[PDB]
């Protein structure tokens, strides 16, 4: 459920004395990976990761591939600068990550924008929601802040986010319509395992659903129950769908008082299920 979205997750990893740093850029529309670039590839190039992407012309691929080379240069340089700012030795490996893009409202106009940077997996600098001011995580990032405040970096980003980002998103949605905007309903069931003396584990299963956005919850006597509910990370089935489960420990003999609720956009009505013997 929600606003449509576009993002890029870009990463560079330094390989001191083993070559150039590894560079990878992954693109997403509505949280679906649709393009990818890996520098360690044999013909480093942006590749379509979705079938509806294969309708772009060769020149699309060339141009973005050029961007990628520019980006490699960018990351390499900034990786070196950061070694400076943090007083670190040049033989160690390090990470630089950039995440950016837009959420778009139903009108087709910009709801929210993102520009965020991490170094060695920790926050470095991020564009606030106003798209005008920066949050800097430490004094090293403060330097970049002053520098970017005087350079007008925020407007540069804002021009991309309000213009290019939204329009590309709109084109992509038009093209990938049939596959991006579909639903696969969850298949649900409950399983029963002994656990301790007088105690049993009930496990609610949700399988083969797309998209990944889902909510599972237990219930005692029709009231929501999340207390001590073990919930695992949503995981990919590997065929485009997801899985998830939720468990609770309940008294032996009292299982009939519990129910599992599944919420997902694919369902015409929420599921309510219980452990059914034999």
């Amino acid at each position: 459920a929600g606003p449509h979205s576009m993002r890029y997750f870009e990463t560079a990893v330094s390989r001191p004395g083993l070559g150039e740093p590894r560079y990878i850029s992954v693109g997403y529309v509505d949280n679906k990976e649709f393009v990818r670039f890996d520098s360690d590839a044999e013909n480093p190039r942006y590749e379509p990761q979705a079938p509806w992407m294969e309708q772009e012309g060769p020149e699309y691929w060339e141009r973005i591939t050029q961007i990628a080379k520019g980006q490699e240069q960018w990351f390499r340089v900034n990786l070196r600068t950061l070694l400076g700012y943090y007083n670190q030795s040049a033989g160690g490996t390090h990470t630089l990550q950039w995440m950016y893009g837009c959420d778009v409202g139903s009108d087709g106009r910009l709801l929210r924008g993102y520009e965020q940077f991490a170094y060695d997996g920790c926050d470095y600098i991020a564009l606030n929601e106003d798209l005008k001011t920066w949050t800097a995580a430490d004094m090293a990032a403060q330097i970049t802040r002053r520098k970017w405040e005087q350079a007008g970096a925020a407007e540069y980003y804002r021009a991309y986010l309000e213009g290019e980002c939204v329009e590309w998103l709109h084109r992509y949605l038009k093209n990938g319509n049939a596959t991006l905007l579909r639903t696969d309903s969850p298949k649900a069931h409950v399983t029963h395992h002994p656990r301790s003396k007088g105690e049993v584990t009930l496990r609610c299963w949700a399988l083969g659903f797309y998209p990944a956005d889902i909510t599972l919850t237990w219930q005692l006597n029709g009231e929501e129950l999340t207390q001590d509910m073990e919930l695992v990370e949503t995981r990919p089935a590997g065929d485009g769908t997801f899985q998830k489960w939720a468990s609770v420990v309940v008294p032996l003999g009292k299982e009939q008082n519990y129910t599992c609720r599944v919420y997902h956009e694919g369902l015409p009505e929420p599921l309510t299920l219980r452990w059914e013997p034999p």
């Binding site: 870009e10 980006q71 340089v77 600068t81 950039w98 520098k147 290019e164």
Partner: peptide
Amino acid sequence: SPSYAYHQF
């Protein structure tokens, strides 16, 4: 379509 980071640290 992706974008230049452009600004430097």
